[model samples]
Target: KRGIDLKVQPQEPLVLWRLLRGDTDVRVERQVELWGLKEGTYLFQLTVTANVTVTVLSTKQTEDYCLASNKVGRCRGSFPRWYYDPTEQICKSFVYGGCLGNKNNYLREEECILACRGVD
Candidate 1:
């Protein structure tokens, strides 16, 4: 009586992970963004505490992902990342904490359309 999201994030050198509610799946290729269960926006969640390191930097107004300011924060980062919604064939705007390591982030409007708009 329910639909589901895997809710896991084990990037490599992380920690041990296990099942909670025991929901599972077969093999399929999906990056599953850190948002939610919306299309390609969902993925694995942590089982418990994990060991992850961090670093710092300095810069501002460096760029935009495409045609939208997806990021909205005040630590010196509001970089937009163009998310190509294949189902809609539309570039959905979003931003991450660092705003760069994201693979889906594109450069130009026509580039986003040209690259991700191929499904239609």
Candidate 2:
């Protein structure tokens, strides 16, 4: 859910729930909790008496992952991992070495195909 349900303290203080995207503010509706947001994991913060509260809204979707560049990492571990091949427009398996792999690396083929099903 892209909604931030911030509980208010009964101390009569005004609580402003501002959901931020990166360094700039995402401009929230003062009383409305619904956030019509994007596909990335958003970093949200709440302020009260100068207390900084960070709320993580990790709305995971394969949309950004599929468009990522393929990386097999630099390690020698030849663990078979799946990646989206834009050239063939399909999910193909590669010998993943462990580290440095990008979002295009998937643990299985199903997600890679589902993510970039019809892309060129």
Instruction: Write the residue-wise lDDT of candidate 2 on 1-120 in tens digits.
Output: 343322111111222344445343344566334333332233455564122222222223343466566787788888888877777888888888899778777676764554455665
| Residue 120 accuracy (lDDT) in model 2 | 57
Top candidate, metric lDDT: 2
Clashing pairs in 1: 7-44, 7-45, 8-44, 8-45, 9-44
lDDT per residue for candidate 1 within 19-119, as digits (tens), equals 22212231223222221112122233233343211111011111122222344333456565555565565777665455334334554444455334433
TM-score of 1: 0.31
Give the TM-scores of the predictions, in the order they appear: 0.31, 0.46
| Local distance difference test, candidate 1 | 0.34
Query: Cα RMSD (Å) per model?
Result: 13.9, 12.4
Off by over 4 Å in 1: 1-76
What would you estimate as the lDDT of candidate 2? 0.52
Pairs that collide, model 2? none
Superposed by TM-score, candidate 2 places the C-alpha of residue 68 at a distance from the truth, in angstroms, of 3.9
Best TM-score goes to which candidate?
2
